[PDB]
């Protein structure tokens, strides 16, 4: 009478809680779509939550739809405000907002994400464009250098000799180490409210391929050889623009399409164009920072302990156990343990008595990592035999 218990119908979202994986968590830093707080990062769960917060049409809204339809697990969005309009002015207030010291108080006091991404620098293609591109990268490459474990996801402009002049620009070695560019911008299958297709940056498709091939295969594998789901084609192929093959700038990653298989990510190699330093190869930078994230989790468990020799060996025994299990899981190179990793805490091994009295506890880890199979050098031998 008072109540009628029965079967209803509604489209509310139940949601899911905590996907962890802080190292491969993307962070989208576009402008708010036209009641989230103007600065705090917002946990976006499924694609239903991305529409219930941010609508369906925009620039950040299509990048979230292209994130979860490429196999993304969870994303965070850092809003910035209801931007102006006249998009040559939104896109120099975007860079000016990212240079504020209030960006550092939100990225350093975050500890939930690990892939910095601004997908709205793709709008610079419409639009000095070169000046805006270089202080678009270099602002992102310093927010990650400063932060303990963040990786930038960058992109090149479509026009060659504007993407050539960006790679032939000065970036310090410390900064290159942590950030990557994928060149060909993606033509999606989303309508633009008319017959014409929506062209998005490749980077929401990349950040979904990074954290699903780190969830499925492990973060040590590679982010490449991944079929991009809901893309028609990359807007430009490498057979029509032989620029960017000039070996005089930062390493770039190519997104291509094949015949028997679709649009593939076809590279994993950081902005370091150095042949011997193993801080190229994205999965090397993301594996060793996934070991930073856990070994510093059990290090600060033994933090406000005495500096006596028992607590040094309580810490080696826990780190040696964990590193041996990851070697037997396939994460490190080496057919014996002596060439896979090493630990060396001690009083006259790493520390000294002056280091102990200042309250330090210094532990050394050496690692041996795996190399990709980027080139297959087939040979044929006849072997006559009568």
């Amino acid at each position: 009478t008072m109540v009628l218990p029965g079967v209803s119908y509604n489209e509310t979202l139940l949601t899911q809680a905590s996907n962890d994986d802080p190292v491969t968590m993307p962070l989208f830093i576009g402008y708010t779509p036209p009641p989230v707080t103007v600065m705090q990062p917002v946990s976006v769960g499924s694609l239903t939550q991305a529409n219930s917060l941010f609508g369906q049409r925009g620039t950040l809204a299509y990048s979230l739809r292209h994130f979860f339809e490429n196999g993304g697990l969870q994303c965070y969005v850092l809003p910035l405000g209801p931007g102006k309009g006249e998009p040559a002015a939104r896109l120099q207030e975007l860079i000016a907002a990212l240079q504020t010291p209030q960006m550092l108080e939100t990225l350093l006091a975050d500890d939930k994400t690990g892939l910095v991404l601004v997908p709205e620098l793709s709008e610079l293609n419409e639009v000095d464009a070169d000046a805006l591109w270089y202080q678009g990268w270099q602002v992102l490459l310093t927010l990650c250098r400063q932060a303990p474990q963040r990786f930038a996801l960058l992109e090149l402009p479509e026009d060659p000799a504007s993407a050539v002049t960006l790679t032939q620009q000065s970036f310090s070695a410390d900064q290159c180490q942590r950030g990557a560019a994928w060149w060909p911008r993606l033509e999606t299958s989303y309508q633009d409210e008319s017959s014409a297709p929506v062209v998005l940056s490749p980077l929401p498709a990349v950040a979904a391929a990074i954290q699903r091939s780190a969830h499925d295969n492990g973060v040590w594998k590679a982010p490449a050889n991944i079929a991009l789901a809901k893309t028609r084609r990359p807007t430009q192929s490498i057979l029509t623009s032989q620029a960017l093959l000039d070996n005089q700038g930062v390493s770039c990653n190519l997104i291509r399409s094949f015949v028997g298989k679709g649009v593939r990510l076809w590279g994993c190699r950081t902005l370091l164009n150095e042949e011997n330093t193993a801080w190229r190869y994205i999965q090397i930078r993301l594996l060793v920072s996934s070991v930073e994230h856990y070994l510093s989790k059990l290090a600060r468990a033994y933090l406000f302990e005495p500096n006596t020799a028992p607590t040094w060996m309580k810490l080696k025994g826990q780190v040696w156990t964990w590193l041996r299990q990851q070697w037997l899981a396939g994460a490190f190179f080496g057919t014996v343990e002596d060439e896979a990793f090493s630990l060396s805490i001690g009083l006259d091994e790493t520390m000294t008595e002056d280091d102990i009295r200042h309250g330090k506890m210094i532990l050394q880890v050496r690692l041996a990592l795996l190399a990709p199979a980027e080139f297959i050098a087939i040979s044929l031998t006849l072997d006559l035999r009568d």
Binding site: S189, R232, R233, S257, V259, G262, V263
Partner: protein, 224 residues
């Protein structure tokens, strides 16, 4: 788990027809089996061809999935007050020939979260049953049972027809990728239908102009 810690017993529902229209009795059995077992088996026969080009073996019939399951009843512990003959007057009845029609009862075994062969239930009829009473009383009310059930697969015809239309329902609606071709689009349409869809029929059924007409995102309909 995830809400509470109460047990979920197994329930043996019975019908009379192949489908679920006419319900017979339905019991839930205490003291869960500890172990189930469902055995699959497929019979193959070897081709003794005289030509001796190849070695192969045909597919003849797939034997029905049989389920083995062992129960126990007991009524003398002071929580157990229902006599076990009232609980065995249903297993002996439902795993035998019904008086109405002269057939078995088309049982359906179910458990709370256990998913049988690919469904949430196990249909079928009782191949075997053996009760072996081991303890008694002075007047011999039994009060210890040790039942040894064994069933077969036998699903209904509406469920088996529904699972068939969920795989290749005689249309494909194949999307085209970037850098595509009709011999590749026929192999991707011949995998949705498993029928070797012979590319010249694709360009005739979809009104292609010149065998390269699709434009990286439009669909092609493939029937048979």
């Amino acid at each position: 788990s995830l809400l509470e810690r109460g047990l979920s017993k197994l329930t043996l529902n019975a019908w009379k027809d192949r489908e679920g229209k006419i319900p017979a009795g339905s019991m839930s059995a205490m003291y869960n089996p500890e172990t189930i077992q469902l055995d699959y088996q497929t019979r193959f026969d070897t081709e003794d061809t005289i030509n001796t080009a190849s070695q192969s073996n045909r597919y003849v019939i797939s034997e029905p999935v049989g389920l083995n399951l062992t129960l126990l009843f007991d009524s003398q512990m002071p929580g157990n007050t229902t006599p076990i003959e009232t609980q065995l007057a249903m297993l002996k009845s439902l795993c035998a020939v019904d008086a109405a029609t002269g057939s078995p009862y088309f049982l359906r075994i179910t458990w709370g979260k256990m998913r049988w062969e690919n469904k949430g239930w196990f249909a079928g009829r009782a191949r075997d049953l053996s009760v072996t009473y081991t303890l008694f009383d002075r007047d011999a009310t039994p009060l210890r049972a040790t039942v040894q059930l064994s069933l077969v697969a036998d699903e209904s015809f509406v469920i088996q027809q529904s699972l068939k239309t969920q795989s290749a329902p005689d249309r494909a609606l194949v999307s085209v990728p970037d850098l595509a071709s009709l011999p590749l689009l026929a192999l991707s349409a011949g995998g949705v239908l498993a029928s070797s869809v012979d590319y010249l029929s694709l360009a005739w059924d979809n009104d292609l102009d010149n065998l390269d007409d699709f434009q990286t995102g439009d669909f092609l309909r493939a029937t048979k």
